[PDB]
């Protein structure tokens, strides 16, 4: 037995408690969430074809009490339909509660609740950026390996109403046809280069003509003309992506041809950003709902990289 309704109730009940209160799930409850969600992910396409109405959310990074506030604002499932763009775990206090609630909702509402893969939903990244350590502290490394199997089956992109292309990171010089995404077979890791890497890692840059180097040391940057040509070729209206902290929680690029969403306010207690979600109605009107907080020594970057283990 999955014990699904009990799990959800226990995850939600801490909303009236002090921030940071953990939820006491059993190892076998969490394993069941991983295994059943994994089955559902594999049963649905790797390139999701979704319809509005939908609420689209960016990075969460273990900020569980902000996730609860986001659901309170948007409507707890199944009151609204959701698409999340990845980066559920790492670099926050409560990755486990965060991912467990998201997986539980995927199982409970499989046609109304969707999760894409971010670059933190892979073993090499979440081994070091916090999730492995959180798993080890509360459970064991085997549970982290079970999460990895689940993450290796997440879908990679979505298209909403044939007009909004969604992914965590961005475009790729290797993305010529949507069929190239559809042909990717799961379970899979995220490579250090290539199409799947770029979908989870690339960033827009207004000062790049074409494709450029990325300050992260992985993947690419891309300019506004790349966005415009991609939308024209594929008859799309918007790229919706996440992966960068932005002050209002949402930020446009390329004369509103791309938007970045970031859903973790006051990211890791070090940045003063808001977190946002984008609501898409059945008329394809997109609107924003924001949760806003009240030399070489300069503050560090908020971005992650893929090369921290290099010798």
């Amino acid at each position: 037995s999955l014990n699904l309704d009990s799990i959800i109730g226990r995850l939600l009940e801490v909303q009236g408690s002090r921030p940071g209160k953990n939820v006491q799930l059993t190892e076998n409850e969490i394993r069941g969430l991983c295994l059943k969600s994994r089955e559902i992910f594999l049963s649905q396409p790797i390139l999701l074809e979704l319809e509005a109405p939908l609420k689209i959310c960016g990075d969460i990074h273990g900020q569980y009490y902000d996730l609860l506030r986001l659901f309170e604002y948007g409507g707890f499932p199944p009151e609204s339909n959701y698409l999340f763009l990845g980066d559920y775990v790492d670099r926050g206090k409560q990755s486990l509660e965060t991912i467990c609630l998201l997986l539980a909702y995927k199982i409970k509402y499989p046609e109304n609740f969707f999760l894409l893969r971010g670059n933190h939903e892979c073993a090499s990244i979440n081994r070091i950026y916090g999730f492995y350590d959180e798993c080890k502290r509360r459970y064991n490394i085997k549970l982290w390996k079970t999460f990895t199997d689940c993450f290796n089956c997440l879908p990679i992109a979505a298209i909403v109403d044939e007009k909004i292309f969604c992914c965590h990171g961005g475009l790729s010089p290797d993305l010529q046809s949507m069929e190239q995404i559809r042909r990717i077979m799961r379970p899979t890791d995220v490579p250090d280069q290539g199409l799947l890497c770029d979908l989870l890692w690339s960033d827009p840059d207004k000062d790049v003509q074409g494709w450029g180097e990325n300050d992260r040391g992985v993947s690419f940057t891309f300019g506004a003309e790349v966005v415009a040509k991609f939308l024209h070729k594929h008859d799309l209206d918007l790229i919706c992506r996440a992966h960068q902290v932005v002050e209002d929680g949402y930020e446009f690029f390329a004369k509103r041809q791309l938007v970045t969403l970031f859903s973790a306010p006051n990211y890791c207690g070090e940045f003063d950003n808001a977190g946002a979600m984008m609501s898409v109605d059945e008329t394809l009107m997109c609107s924003f709902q924001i949760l806003k907080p009240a030399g070489s020594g300069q503050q560090g970057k908020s971005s992650s990289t893929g090369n921290l283990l290099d010798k």
Binding site: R18, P19, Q63, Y65, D66, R69, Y73, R91, G92, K93, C122, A123, S124, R127, I128, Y129, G130, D133, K145, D149, N152, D161, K163, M185, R186, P187, T188, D189, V190, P191, D192, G194, H232, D237, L238, R256, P265, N266, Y267, C268, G269, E270, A274, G275, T283, L284, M285, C286, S287, F288, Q289, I290, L291, K292, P293, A294, L308, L309, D310, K311
Partner: protein
């Protein structure tokens, strides 16, 4: 010119975010050279021997130089 369907609302909603201490541990800043070498070895062994990967995707598995 191409017909665009999407529209954006100019009227944004805002709500006050929770006031709490969001700071989290940074274990990735506490890795010696030897620790990094051990993690590269651990990841490589895990991905090679334990982690299930579809045949058609084994070329995507990300190994680390030991």
């Amino acid at each position: 010119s191409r017909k665009i369907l999407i529209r954006f609302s100019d009227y944004v909603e805002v709500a006050d975010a929770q006031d709490y201490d969001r700071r989290a541990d940074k274990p990735w800043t506490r890795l010696t050279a030897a620790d990094k070498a051990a993690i590269r070895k651990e990841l490589n062994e895990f991905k090679s021997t334990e982690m299930e990967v579809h045949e058609l995707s084994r070329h995507l598995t990300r190994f680390h130089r030991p």
